[PDB]
Amino acid sequence: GGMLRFVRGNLLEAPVEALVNTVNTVGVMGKGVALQFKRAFPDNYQAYVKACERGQVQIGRIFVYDRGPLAQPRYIFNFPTKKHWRHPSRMEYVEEGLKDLVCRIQELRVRSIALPPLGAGNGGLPWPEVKQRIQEALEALEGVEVWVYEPV
């Protein structure tokens, strides 16, 4: 039927198939969640740098790294919440990106996934608006467990 869950803790130790990373489109993961993802998942990071180098990372597209069929998590979903790191996030970026998140979850038969507060740290977006978008987008999903890490 589906299940969406608000939790506290550290996203990167979520017991899930797919992890959502918050990225920009300019090829650096210099702070926040993205810095932790660079440290925790170096291979994902190199692949992101390469994808940025092409022109392949843009707003409204998740950049997926497959860590292998025996990897847990198996997927890093690099979610663009910024264009340049110098500028804030925008609600639109989160709306467009959620739409692509839903597609790829289905396409990849992703059964469980965890996210942070998209755009609400270095992006400056109000959490309550971000949450709603996340709820409307993702509780819809059938046979997918969703873990959402609320801030404080």
Ligand X SMILES: Nc1ncnc2c1ncn2[C@@H]1O[C@H](COP(=O)(O)OP(=O)(O)OC[C@H]2O[C@@H](O)[C@H](O)[C@@H]2O)[C@@H](O)[C@H]1O
Catalytic annotation, residues: 82
For ligand X, the closer of residues 1 and 128 by Cβ is 128
127 binds Cl ion (CB under 5 A): no
Please state, as a whole number, how many other Cβ atoms lie within 10 Å of the Cβ of residue 38.
19
Q: Binds 74, which of Cl ion, ligand X, none (CB < 5 to 8 A, cut-off by type)?
A: none
69 - beta bridge partners?
A: none
83: left (phi over 0), alpha (psi -120 to 50) or beta: alpha
Q: Which does 151 bind (CB under 5 to 8 A by kind): ligand X, Cl ion, none?
A: ligand X
Tell me if 62 sits within 8 A of 97, measured CB to CB: yes
Phi, psi of 51 (to 5 degrees): -60, -40
Q: Does 143 bind Cl ion (CB under 5 A)?
A: no
Among positions 29-48, residues that touch Cl ion (CB under 5 A) are 30-31
Helix (H) or strand (E) holding 32: helix 32-40
Q: Which is nearer to ligand X, 32 or 60 (CB)?
A: 32
Residue of 85, 90, 131, 135 that binds Cl ion (CB under 5 A) = 85
Q: Which residues bind Cl ion (CB under 5 A)?
A: 30-31, 85
